Design an enzyme around this catalytic site. Structure first.
Site, PDB file in Angstrom:
ATOM      1  N   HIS A   1       0.976  -1.123   0.077  1.00  0.00           N
ATOM      2  CA  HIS A   1       0.060  -0.059   0.019  1.00  0.00           C
ATOM      3  C   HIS A   1       0.827   1.136  -0.082  1.00  0.00           C
ATOM      4  CE1 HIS A   1      -2.266  -3.240   1.969  1.00  0.00           C
ATOM      5  NE2 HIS A   1      -3.203  -3.174   1.070  1.00  0.00           N
TER       6      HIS A   1
ATOM      7  N   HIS B   1       5.416   6.506   7.274  1.00  0.00           N
ATOM      8  CA  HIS B   1       5.061   6.252   5.812  1.00  0.00           C
ATOM      9  C   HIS B   1       4.494   7.454   5.139  1.00  0.00           C
ATOM     10  CE1 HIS B   1       1.031   5.426   7.941  1.00  0.00           C
ATOM     11  NE2 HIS B   1       0.541   6.431   6.766  1.00  0.00           N
TER      12      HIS B   1
ATOM     13  N   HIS C   1       1.874   9.167   1.663  1.00  0.00           N
ATOM     14  CA  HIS C   1       0.714   9.169   0.617  1.00  0.00           C
ATOM     15  C   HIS C   1       1.225   9.705  -0.465  1.00  0.00           C
ATOM     16  CE1 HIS C   1      -1.797   6.790   3.513  1.00  0.00           C
ATOM     17  NE2 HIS C   1      -1.357   7.722   4.310  1.00  0.00           N
TER      18      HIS C   1
ATOM     19  N   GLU D   1      -3.597  13.526   1.681  1.00  0.00           N
ATOM     20  CA  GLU D   1      -4.828  12.993   2.145  1.00  0.00           C
ATOM     21  C   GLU D   1      -5.671  14.106   2.765  1.00  0.00           C
ATOM     22  OE1 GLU D   1      -4.556   8.469   2.672  1.00  0.00           O
ATOM     23  OE2 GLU D   1      -3.881   9.359   4.625  1.00  0.00           O
TER      24      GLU D   1
ATOM     25  N   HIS E   1       3.306  10.864   7.268  1.00  0.00           N
ATOM     26  CA  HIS E   1       2.541  10.513   8.439  1.00  0.00           C
ATOM     27  C   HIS E   1       3.463   9.893   9.415  1.00  0.00           C
ATOM     28  CE1 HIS E   1      -1.855  10.204   6.494  1.00  0.00           C
ATOM     29  NE2 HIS E   1      -1.586  11.357   6.676  1.00  0.00           N
TER      30      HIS E   1
ATOM     31  N   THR F   1      -6.139   6.357   8.128  1.00  0.00           N
ATOM     32  CA  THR F   1      -6.492   6.262   6.732  1.00  0.00           C
ATOM     33  C   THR F   1      -6.591   5.111   6.055  1.00  0.00           C
ATOM     34  OG1 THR F   1      -4.816   7.266   5.771  1.00  0.00           O
ATOM     35  CG2 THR F   1      -5.947   8.971   7.143  1.00  0.00           C
ATOM     36  N   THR F   2      -6.090   3.992   6.499  1.00  0.00           N
ATOM     37  CA  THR F   2      -6.188   2.773   5.740  1.00  0.00           C
ATOM     38  C   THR F   2      -6.802   1.914   6.761  1.00  0.00           C
ATOM     39  OG1 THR F   2      -4.133   2.201   6.908  1.00  0.00           O
ATOM     40  CG2 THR F   2      -3.714   2.909   4.614  1.00  0.00           C
TER      41      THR F   2
HETATM   42 ZN   LIG Z   1      -1.049   7.573   6.346  1.00  0.00          ZN
END
Ligand SMILES: [Zn+2]
EC number: 4.2.1.1
Length: 258
Positions: free
Chosen positions: A62, A92, A94, A104, A117, A196-197
């Protein structure tokens, strides 16, 4: 099937396996600066990363995670809206397929190229497994990336990404200094929200820094060469691994700054 960011298994499908996806405290959100009021009661933030001990970087299909040894009060987040001490466990990002998207959170509807994040857990709870279940269990520091000059503190990460091209690959990654990913200002917005996952657990105090960091186009392009797919499978470039803004519902977003 199991979850991803594709037309068939992306954010619009998540609620089927994770009903909290339609919950009252989902993240990310849009931050409307006109309505996110200055709060004079917010104590200031303490980001204390001097003793951070990175362990490994891994592609989990992901994104990629950089994991830390969270066994001692090494790298911790405190102050701001937080009650107590939160240990850094992993960071991690995005990012998008194009500069115009990838974050995000959004600020007055603006999407940044990417979003970092740093995920921490409340020492009230003993370990990450217990914390992640509690509304006060986690704090995530979010930092916007815009494309401009190189972030030299990101280069150690960029230069190992060759080695974790595909899902399930990992590599030892020691002596990484997360202080190298911070902007100058610690001014921030805060609200209560979620992972958020999946599993999208509503257990996160969100601290989202106002000042983006700059990263270079070459650095972002290296994120964009990662694969969602496992080795030997058909190529699916890991890009657009962001969930979009979710309804704010009854929540307030508070700003630390005027
Ligand atoms: Zn995240």
């Amino acid at each position: 099937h199991h979850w991803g960011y594709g037309k068939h298994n992306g954010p619009e499908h998540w609620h089927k396996d994770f009903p909290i996806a339609k919950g009252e405290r989902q993240s990310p959100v849009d931050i409307d600066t006109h309505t996110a009021k200055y709060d004079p009661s917010l104590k200031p933030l303490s980001v204390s990363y001097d003793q951070a001990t990175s362990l490994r970087i891994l592609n989990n299909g992901h994104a990629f995670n950089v994991e830390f040894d969270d066994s001692q009060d090494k790298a911790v987040l405190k102050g701001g809206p937080l009650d107590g001490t939160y240990r850094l466990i992993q960071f991690h990002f995005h990012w998008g397929s194009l500069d115009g998207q990838g974050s995000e959170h959004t600020v007055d509807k603006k999407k940044y190229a990417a979003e970092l994040h740093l995920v921490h857990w409340n020492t009230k709870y003993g370990d990450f497994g217990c914390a992640v279940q509690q509304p006060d269990g986690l704090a995530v520091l979010g930092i916007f990336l815009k494309v401009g000059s190189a972030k030299p503190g990101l280069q150690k990460v960029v230069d190992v990404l060759d080695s974790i091209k595909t899902k399930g690959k990992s590599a030892d990654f020691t002596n990484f200094d997360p202080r190298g990913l911070l902007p100058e200002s610690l001014d921030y917005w805060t609200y209560p929200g979620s992972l958020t996952t999946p599993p999208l657990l509503e257990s996160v105090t969100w601290i989202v820094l106002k000042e983006p960091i700059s990263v270079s186009s070459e650095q972002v392009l290296k994120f964009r060469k990662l694969n969602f797919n496992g080795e030997g499978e058909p190529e699916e470039l890991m890009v657009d691994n962001w969930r979009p803004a979710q309804p704010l519902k009854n929540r307030q977003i508070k700003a630390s700054f005027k």
